[PDB]
Amino acid sequence: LSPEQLVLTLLEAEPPHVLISRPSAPFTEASMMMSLTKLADKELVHMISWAKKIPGFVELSLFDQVRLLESCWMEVLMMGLMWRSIDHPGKLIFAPDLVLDRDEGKCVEGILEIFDMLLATTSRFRELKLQHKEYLCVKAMILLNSSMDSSRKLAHLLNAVTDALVWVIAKSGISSQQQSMRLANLLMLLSHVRHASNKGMEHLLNMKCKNVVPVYDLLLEMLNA
């Protein structure tokens, strides 16, 4: 599979956007948590399908597939979130009818900090002018790098996608030195995405224990890991 074919395959695999409506009344801690969790749960179903389209993923042992997804789901969800928000600065586009402002995070104690992180990171991707095809590769790399001979195969799968990201960057035309610097700049943001996902994850687990919101089905299971 050539780098371009892998990129085209990821493009096709992109999940369709999940539609969720903004509550009628102004947000309350509960209505906002119910909105974010209901969305996540729905996005998680499409994420599994997306994963099965990543070339070679279904060839990994079932236990590896489960392990990879359990480890990176929030990070993958937030990467998508930030991409959807790339062209609407100061805002987080959770879904077409659910455009939340930095300030609307106030209603949920502890959320504003997460919204700030996500927005800041989004700004950084905007600054680097992240392109759709680089985004496709990076999101798949998040999944394959969550290694948190099926392992030979995993390393080989990750190298394939890494290979495609290099190809996409080379396609921008910039100098070889700049291509190396852009690759570095893009991957160095994975720590920031991961940081926000860890905070969102800690926040969510805690919101569960307080029954501030119902966390079950796909979402719950993924939460316990």
């Binding site: 599994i48 399908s49 359990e70 796909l218 299971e221």
Partner: peptide, 10 residues
């Protein structure tokens, strides 16, 4: 388990 169902049964 839901995750395993979607990965292998869906």
């Amino acid at each position: 388990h839901k995750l395993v169902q979607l990965l292998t049964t869906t």
